[PDB]
Amino acid sequence: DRSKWHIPIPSGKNYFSFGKILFRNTTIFLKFDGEPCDLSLNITWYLKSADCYNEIYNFKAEEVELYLEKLKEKRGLSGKYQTSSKLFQNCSELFKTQTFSGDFMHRLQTWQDAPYIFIVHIGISENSLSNLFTMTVEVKGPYEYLTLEDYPLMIFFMVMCIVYVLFGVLWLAWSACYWRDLLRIQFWIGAVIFLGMLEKAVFYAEFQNIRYKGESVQGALILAELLSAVKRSLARTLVIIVSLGYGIVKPRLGVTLHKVVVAGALYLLFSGMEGVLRVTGAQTDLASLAFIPLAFLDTALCWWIFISLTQTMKLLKLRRNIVKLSLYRHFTNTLILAVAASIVFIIWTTMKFRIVTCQSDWRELWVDDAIWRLLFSMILFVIMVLWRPSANNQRFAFSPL
């Protein structure tokens, strides 16, 4: 989120806040360039290692002075703080070579892997002073500008990009031998795989912008989450279509196919906008509002899938189609395992994310934005195992009916 804070020092506000999770031996450069003046400048900076997760991210910029008044007499805050209040007589003297050196720690090189907070207050003694010195706050760790909050997601997306690359190679290796036996579901699954390709490719490019150039582009994040929303929407659309048995039950569903794609479009029009809200860091009211129709939609759509699945299971039980019955029985078992794993992951992660008074284990929050993608990737792998090409796949996949 723009770790190189290019904030020009204004007259409207005098307090800058920077609260993240940082590597040990991370340095915080401050770059000061501006039109030199003659004003007395008192720069006070604070670097505090808040041991708890809550006192930095639930912390808001409104209570910066309240956090200061808590820290001065040690109310409600735990950890060690480091500070200096070096004074500058003239504005020009700030521009001159004043390479920062840390003074003394009271119980700017970082001392541990922890969530830190960084507060700068600039005492002035107006319109020109508004946005005069472009203060560039540059955080620089051992692995360049990347932070622990964003660190394991990057290597995780390395790994899962490798996973989909292997998936695409395997899919093409399967499709190379046989082409005349391919039906529309094969092209649709290939499309889902390629959507995963493009989505995780642009998202990885976004993290590459984060680590090398150190800048955040919101449009790439919009594109990535929009692609993911379209991808999972089309995936569950395929699940619903298969659960109704296209061709096996009815050659063309028609108006019910229109209602299926309308259900998919409604799911998009809610959940994709929800994901776009997650991109921009939606406020607490919008965040609380967003997931109610989302959760209701997941419950309703999944229940409809189970109803359709049991119904087509009964019909195929009447049909006495042996190998198809075995394959779709494995499909139902996969769906049961997927739903159970997903719901237990939801309960564990979401409940223990907020019920506990202090998230004291900061290291394992990269799983939260990763477990859904891991589950869905495993689901895609199982589906590709079930739908592997073969010589008798012409009779195995579909029968004239």
Numbering used by the authors: 38 to 144, 174 to 191, 199 to 474
From the paper:
TMEM87s are eukaryotic transmembrane proteins with two members (TMEM87A and TMEM87B) in humans. TMEM87A consists of a Golgi-dynamics (GOLD) domain atop a membrane-spanning seven-transmembrane helix domain with a large cavity open to solution and the membrane outer leaflet. We propose TMEM87A and structurally homologous GOST proteins could serve a common role in trafficking membrane-associated cargo.
Cryo-EM was used to determine the structure of TMEM87A to a nominal resolution of 4.7 Å, with better resolved regions reaching ~4.3 Å in the core of the protein. About 37 N-terminal residues (amino acids 1–37), 88 C-terminal residues (475-555), and 36 residues in loops within the extracellular domain (145–173, 192–198) were not resolved in the cryo-EM map and are unmodeled. In TMEM87A, helix 8 turns back towards the center of the protein and packs against the bottom of the transmembrane domain. Density within the membrane exposed portion of the hydrophobic cavity is consistent with a bound phospholipid. A partial lipid is modeled based on density, chemical environment, and relationship to WLS, but we note this assignment is speculative given the relatively low resolution of the reconstruction.
